[PDB]
Each structure stands twice: as structure tokens, then as C-alpha cells.
Amino acid sequence: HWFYGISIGQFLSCFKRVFIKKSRETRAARTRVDEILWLLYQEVYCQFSTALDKKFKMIMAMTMFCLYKFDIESEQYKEAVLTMIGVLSESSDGVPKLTVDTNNDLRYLWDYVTTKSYISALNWFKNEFFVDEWNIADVVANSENNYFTMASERDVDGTFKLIELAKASKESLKIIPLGSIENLNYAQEEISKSKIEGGWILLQNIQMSLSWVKTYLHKHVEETKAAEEHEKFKMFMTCHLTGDKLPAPLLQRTDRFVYEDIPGILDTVKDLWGSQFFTGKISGVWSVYCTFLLSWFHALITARTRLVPHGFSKKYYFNDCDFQFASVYLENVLATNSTNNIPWAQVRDHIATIVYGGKIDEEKDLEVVAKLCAHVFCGSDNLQIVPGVRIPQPLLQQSEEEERARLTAILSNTIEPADSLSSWLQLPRESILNYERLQAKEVASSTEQLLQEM
Amino acid sequence: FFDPIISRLISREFNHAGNRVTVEIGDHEVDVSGDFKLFIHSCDPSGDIPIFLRSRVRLVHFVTNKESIETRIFDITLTEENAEMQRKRED
Amino acid sequence: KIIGSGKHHDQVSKFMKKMFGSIESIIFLEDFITGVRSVEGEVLNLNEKIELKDSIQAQEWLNILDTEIKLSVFTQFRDCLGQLKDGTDIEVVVSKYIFQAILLSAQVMWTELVEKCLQTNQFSKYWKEVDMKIKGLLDKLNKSSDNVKKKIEALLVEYLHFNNVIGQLKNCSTKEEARLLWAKVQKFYQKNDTLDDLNSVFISQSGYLLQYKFEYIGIPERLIYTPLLLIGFATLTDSLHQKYGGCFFGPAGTGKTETVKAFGQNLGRVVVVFNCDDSFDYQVLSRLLVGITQIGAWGCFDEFNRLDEKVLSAVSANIQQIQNGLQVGKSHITLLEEETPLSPHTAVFITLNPGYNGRSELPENLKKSFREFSMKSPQSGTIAEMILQIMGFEDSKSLASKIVHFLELLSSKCSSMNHYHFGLRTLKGVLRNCSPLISEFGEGEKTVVESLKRVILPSLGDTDELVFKDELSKIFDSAGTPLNSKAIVQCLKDAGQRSGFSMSEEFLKKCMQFYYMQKTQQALILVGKAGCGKTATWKTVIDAMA
Amino acid sequence: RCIINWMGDWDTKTMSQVANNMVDVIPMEFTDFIVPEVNKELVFTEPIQTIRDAVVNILIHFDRNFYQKMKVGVNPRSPGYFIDGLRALVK
């Protein structure tokens, strides 16, 4: 992958810092050098996991576990774990193996495989290794390079995470949304100032910045060799995995981190509702009611779009702009129409065919969105938005403070069940199970091609 | 890159006089000095280089140390893991 | 050239087509601007004859005529609305006013009438009235002159759309469904109380109010109304209402550029269409962009999917600047290294034809300012039925269904190869080419069969004509008889004998195909195996027709 | 029209004779040779009596072994490193 590049110097630096990290007591096992080597594994895994996404994180984790264990253990253990991983990749499935009272880990793995908890069977590799997973703060503080790439997809961001990290320690963030040539020269003068000032900075969507960063920022980073002695500024550039390829010298010079913190569905409703409502209401109780309804709908569609091919035949990206357009359309139709259930059908059609159906190009996905919209919007008398929450209509006295209070309370008190991916989303449990099956197949397969490569 | 104007020096080609050393370069019998030293530096190793220089010029690998690895991390370990006897040997 | 020769004030007339795109000639009485004539030859009468003196520069009276033509359009609209309001048939009106005025007046009148009918739920009477109007316009069209026949067909497009709307809403049972469909379709309104005559008329669709502009369009071909077209219009106006430019994407042969062109058409705008990535330099792009942002017109970047990276980046920067200027609303924008005013009415639309991989997308810097909309296959059956109705028919419904089914079956059956194309363009070509053949032949389905033979058949491989005739026999049962061959075949035989060429039924068929299909097409491509008499073929046809 | 002459890389006779001719200047060092009864089967030269033949044979052996190891199969490259190696040896 283009982003997953690596340098010799990074490996040697991590190797050097393996030793002087005499932080946590290593396991009281064979000799000193063996535990030093195991600590080397733990350190390199902790450092280099942050540059890899969840799937690659997992495959590298298990492959590295196998690399350690095959060399450190007996032939029986090696062939048993080989049979286990073959069972995981049912394209190379075999017969399970049993070692009596010796390797409790393998019984746990076989239990996870049999119990259809494939994701737990995977995560066992990381859990057993007693690793110390990191966040942005740990990698930023511990690393010495001033540059960091804020890798993510086009549907989730760490901007709020970075802002709250700054507010947690030393602040100094200067969000610089790059854009037009005026935006361009403002950004370059800002970074020139921040080089001496040493304040934190953040640039948005380096992909669209491609020309400027190739011409200016790449050259500036090349020239900033001795300038790192200046006040301790933090360089944060947001890059998108599906975006255009970034120049190799720039990505190599900087440090890399990727974001995977996908908030829960209830969390999505929480933060979308808060960010939408803190600007103040416009019209009567029905306005905030339909705003709540469309916020929930946006949460469901954002949830469903993360599953491919189960649900949608292909991946889509729903930007907030759709949310603003939905809000504007609902506000306008409510202002135009009287306080009745009259415009529900037309609002549903408009949302499913223009606001959210415009991007989509598959009649199956159009039908899915249409049925979801009909379920969520059409109806009255305590609509069951999710099987665990009942949403009644606004009452006849039309007070909006009580409505906002009741909406916030019903959002807070209600809890999200673990099966929300299959319960809140109208998907058969077979669908999600086969999704986990496909995930296990792809990760495990890649792990074989890796291991036969060695 | 390579042009056959330094050809008369990449391969020994000098019409020495009785007491003066001359080389036919371009259109001038350019003067030479005993302290003149020329060294060709390359940017990347993957790029193909002309065969004539490979015949003549003395290639030396200062390339990035991807291979081996054992030597570098071995040096790091000896300088780091109980270094006293290792560098006391050099002492 | 125009400035240095601004004395004859007639040499500019052949320039002003480029700088309006709707009009190409200007009328002169003796030295005064009597009016203008559009590309289809429709003559616009200007109420205020602009007197010209030798001192006034060209651009000054150009500026005055910009507003003068719009004022005349509004006045003709007012007269047409007044004449229609007091119960007058459209037929006596079609010969009096311009096509724009009659179309917009009919739209407003129909809007009000269907509003009151929806308030009363008595659509049967209005449906009958519309049907009689359709029949009267149909029978008037036959004996009319072509110059006005263009007007009759153009208005019949909108009247057919209205009749379809009325019928489908009458079939709808609930008041709520009626309101749904009525808000779904475009709705016309005017404000007489407002003193500003230019903005006295406006369009309302999906609850969004857009101000109509009385800019002149002439009589461009009317894009028939289809559901998918209505969704396209709705998404376009929704994107515009929040000052975001529209963005259409999808497979080729979907009329996306034609869709936005029809949008500007019925909304009263000349959408400057720039076909892109053919030979064109960035400087003229900057010039036209500055012009459109200074005048308030609308631009569409046809075939925007393909561009070289540097020009694409430059135009993306410029378009991001202008779109953000619309967003903020600042009067001046510093684009093209110069402070330029920005009209509030300026808007930009983009079309994305499929790439080598298929789905082609805008540069990511535009994602925050545009709304991509996929475009599906248009309702070819509906458009074929409407065209057959507007050309007069007997069984247009099943005939259009048969034509669409036959074209799809031809696409599925015959071998696929690079130049084969059975998209909407081919069907449109058949329906636009049959008309002289319809005049020569009857109006029966056999005339359509002959048009199919004269258009698609001579561009196939041997097995492909085998499949073509097999499916022609399967679907249609009209074979036809040879006609007007008693002379052209004799001429071909004489030419072959005088050239020493052996006439053959293969050769005769190829020559007949070429002669038939050269009448319409201007520039011809001839393809066949090396030295297969193609030179001889066109020699024979050319001297035989001589 | 042109006459083509395939010269190719030098063979064992060529290296033996040529390196003999050059090491004519320095075929001998202090005291005498290490015991000159090594295997004669792989001797491309005349029987060993000084260092001369052992040196030329070891040089040619290393040369073709390095060529057959660095590449695989046909090696269309003549010994150029041989000349630099022998110059370094004599100097």
C-alpha cells in the first residue's frame, strides 16, 4: 500500500529505544536476552501498529506472534497453530489439534472458532500479547519528529480528537483549512510564523492541497532540516487513504498515524444532535422533532454505509452537506406547510431521491434507502425507530423546551445493545456473520501469503 | 549520465610530452595537474549506468544498508547491551 | 474587428451569435434596430426601434439592446397572458407572439387552472379541454408553415407534458398523493404587485422559489418531459437553492448536458455550453468564466471528466474560488489576478461522462461545494411515444414500445464491436430522419421500418444484418415494397455499364444504401475490406446521381 | 554488408598467458615458494615452479567463480575487474 511505506532509520531508531525502555518488568522467563527480544517485539509492535489500519494491524499482529512462537516453541505447537490458522481460512481448513493441558491458548482459539466469534478469535492475537496500544498523544509526545500525518478515511475524522488533545495539554492548535490562493498564502505565512513561534498547527485534506504541498510544502519540509531546532511546533496534516498518493519523500520524512475511532450509533446521535442544536431552533416543536428524526436517519445511513457488500453493494461516503440539505429542506417544507402530517410522503421521496439518493447509483441501494426512510419518517404514535426506543409525537400544547428536554433524556437513558449492528439495522444475523466470515477469510489469506513469503 | 568528453580521462589517454602531460579534450590540449582528482557520485542504484564506465570506473557501494541488518543491530546491541567489554576491547 | 469597423453596424451581426448563442442576425429598417432573428429563423420583433447614430459606439447600443430584448419579451408575455386570460384559443395566438412568451404564458395559465382544479377535484373537465386543445393543435400543425410549425411542435411538447400530468393525477385517489405529485412537478407563479417587471415571474418546484429570467432563447428543440428529467430538475434546483453548483455523472448517452440545456431553456437562460478537452486553451476558459461571472449567465462543462492534470487543477481552483464567492456572497472576487464583480445569478454546472474505469469523479476540493447526481437510463419508451404523438400517429403507444424493444433486442443479439451504437442518439436519429420518408411514404409503421433500414442496417456485419432482418420479421409484420427505384436503379445500371462495372445485387444494395443515406448525412465515412470497390461504389453512385 | 567477428570474453589460455606476461616483473618474493605440489588437473597453465602459476590460477579461478555466482547462465561480460585486480596486485 502507498501509505504503508517504511524506512531503515525508523527501524533502527525503534531498535535502539527498545533497550533503554526499561519501563515495565519483563516476564520472568528464560535468560535476559530472550526477554529483551520479546520486549523488542512488544516495542516494535506498539510503535508500528499506529501506522497501520485495523485489518493490517491484525494481520501483522498475528503473523508476528507466529514468527515469535514458531521459533520459540516445539514442532507440535507449530503444526497445531498452523492447523488453527488453516481452520480460520476455510479455503485451507483441516482438522483441529489437541495438546493436553499444555497450551491453554489453543483451546481458547478453537473455542472462538467453533463459537462463530471470529472477531474475538482474531483479537486473541493482540490480547494474549499484553500489548500497550497507543493514542495520538503517546506517539506525538514520544516521537521527536515535528511532522505527523493524520491518516483516516473520508467518513471519519480525528479533528475533534486533536482539538481535545490540545485542550488537554498545552493547546496551541492553529487549525488551517487550506483552500483558495488567498487561503494558500495565508496558510504558508501562518506556517512560516509558526516555525519560529512553535505553536501547534493542523492542515485539512492534503489531497486537495496536492499542487501546493508538492510545490511549497514538500520543498519547505525538504529545507527544514536545521529548522527543527526552533520552538517545538507540531505539524499535523490530514490525509485520506482513498485519496491521491502523497509524495514519497514527504511521507517518509514525517511520522504516520491512522484514525479508527468510529463512534457508536448512540454516540453519533449524541454528537450530531448536540452540534445541530447548539445553534438554536428556528420554528415550532415540529421543527426540532423532524430534526431529531433526520439526525437518527443520518446515524442509521452512516452505520449501514460502513458494511460492504452486506447492505450496500458498494461503499459510499455521506458528507455532512447532505445533513445540512436535509435540515434545510425539512425547515422549508415545515415553514411552507401547516402543522400537520401532510408532507411526510413528499419529504420521504425528496430525501430518498435527491438529498441522499442523488449520489447513489444502484436501484437496490435506492430501494434500501427508500424502505429505511419510509420506516423512519412515515408514521406517528410512538414510532419504533429502533426496537429499544419509542419516539412519540409532540403533544398538543406545543412547548419546545419540554420537547428538547425529553429528546435529550430519551437519548441519554436508552442504552445501545451490542447487537445494534444487526438489531438497530434491519439486517439478518446471517448477513453480519458472513461479513465476519469474509473478513476472517481475507485477513487470514493475506497472512498465509505473508508467511509462505518468509 | 556520462559523455565521452571525460572519456580521455576515465580511461587513461594522455599524449605525454618530454616534460609536460597533455590530454586531448574537446578541441584543446587542456593542461593537467597531478592533484586533479575526479569522482563520480550516483543518485540511485536502481537506475542503469553505462557499461563503459562499469568497465573502467571503480564502483563502490555506499548504498543504504538494507542488506545484512545483522551488523548494524549487532553493533547497536553491543554498544547498548552490557557494552563495557565490547568497547573496552576497542580501548 | 467589431470596434475598428463599428460604422456599418452589420458586420457585428455575424459575431453576435458567438456572444449570445441564441440569436445570429439583427434586423435593420433603414438604420434602426427593428428586431432580431434566432438560429431557427424565428423573427423577434423589438417594440422600441433602437435608433442608431454614427457617434454611439457599438457596445453602448449593445448594452441598451440587452435590456431592450428582455423588455420586449416581457411585453409580449404580458400581451399573450392578457389574450389567454379572457378565454381565447391558443391557435389564434401562436402566430402573434414569440415562442418563449406563449410557452411561459401557457405554463402559468395551466398552473393556475390546475391549482383551482386541485382545490375542487374536478379534473375531468380540464382534461377534456386539454385533449381538445391537443387535437386542434395537431390538425393545425399539418397545414401550418414550417416557420410556425416549429412553434406548434415546441408548445405541443409542453401541452403533452401537461396532459400526462393531469391524467396521472386524476388517476391518483387521495388528496395527499395529488399534493405530492403536484409539488413534485414544476409550478409557475407571477407577482403582479411587485413593480419590477423583469423579476415579476418565477418558478416554484419542491417548495423552492427560483426567479425566472426573461432572457431570450429562440426555438431550440424541446426536450420532452420524463420522470427522470423531473428528478434531474429537482436535484438541480435543490443544489442551486443553497448556492451550490450542480454536478451530473453517469454513462454517456444520457443527455445530461441536454438536461441542463433544457433547464436553462424553460427557465429562460442561455446556458453557455463549453464542450471540453478537445483542443481548447486555458486562457479562453478564463475569459469565458470571467464573462459569465460578470454577466450572471450559467455554464456547463461538458465532458469535464477528461482533462489534463494541470489545466484541470487550474480550472478547479478558479471554480472553487467562484463557488466560494457565491457561498459567502462577497461582491468582488480576486480571480484571474484581477478584482471582478460577481452577479448573484451566476451559477455553474458540471457533467461527468464515464471514464475508462467508469465512475469519474470531481477533484476532491470541489466535494464541499458540489452535489454529484447519478443519471440513469432515460425513459426511451416515453420519449418515443411523445415524439410519435407530436409527429402524428395511428398507434403511437405500441409502435414506440415496439421500437424501444427492437432496439434493446438488437443491442443484445448482434455481435458487439467498437463502432456499434444503439443508444438514444440512434433512436432520435431515426425519428428525425423518417420525416421526409414519411412525406414520401405513408405514416404507417412500414415507414418507420424503412427508416430503420436506411439508418442502422447499412452499418452492420453480415451476421448482424441476418439478425437484424430476423428480429425485424419477429417484431414487426410490415415488410414493404420497393418504390422510386424505377429511375435510380436505371441510373446506377447505366453508370455501371459506362464504367464497365458488373452490377450485382450486393453492389446494388450497397449503392442504394449509400444513395439513400447520403441525402441527410453531410460528411461520410466508408469502411470495408481493402480494395472492396468502395471507391468504385462512390464513383458509381456519384455519376449515376449526376 | 559488414563482416561480423565474434570475439567474446577471454578464455583460460588468454588469462594465463597475459597474467604471466605481466607478473613477469614480480614472479618471486622473499625466500622460496610455499610447497608447489598442488593439484595439477585444474592447472590451466604450465606446471607450477614459482608463485607465478599458482597466483594466475587462483586469480582466474576467483574471477570465473565470481562471474558464475553473481549472475546465472551466460555471462556476456569480459573480465575488466581482472585488470584492476592485477594492477593492484603488482603495485
Ligand SMILES: Nc1ncnc2c1ncn2[C@@H]1O[C@H](COP(=O)(O)OP(=O)(O)OP(=O)(O)O)[C@@H](O)[C@H]1O
Ligand atoms: N461493381 C463492380 N463491378 C466490377 N468490378 C468492380 C466493381 N466494383 C469494384 N470492382 C473492381 O474491384 C476493385 C475495386 O477495388 P478498390 O481499390 O477500388 O476498392 P476500395 O476498397 O474502394 O479501395 P482501397 O482499399 O484501395 O482504398 C477494382 O479492381 C475494380 O475493377
Ligand SMILES: Nc1ncnc2c1ncn2[C@@H]1O[C@H](COP(=O)(O)OP(=O)(O)O)[C@@H](O)[C@H]1O
Ligand atoms: N428526455 C429526453 N428526451 C429526448 N431525447 C433525449 C432526452 N434525454 C437525452 N436525449 C437525447 O440523448 C442524447 C444523449 O446526450 P449525451 O451525449 O448523453 O449528453 P452528454 O454530453 O451530457 O453526455 C442527446 O443528444 C439528447 O438528444
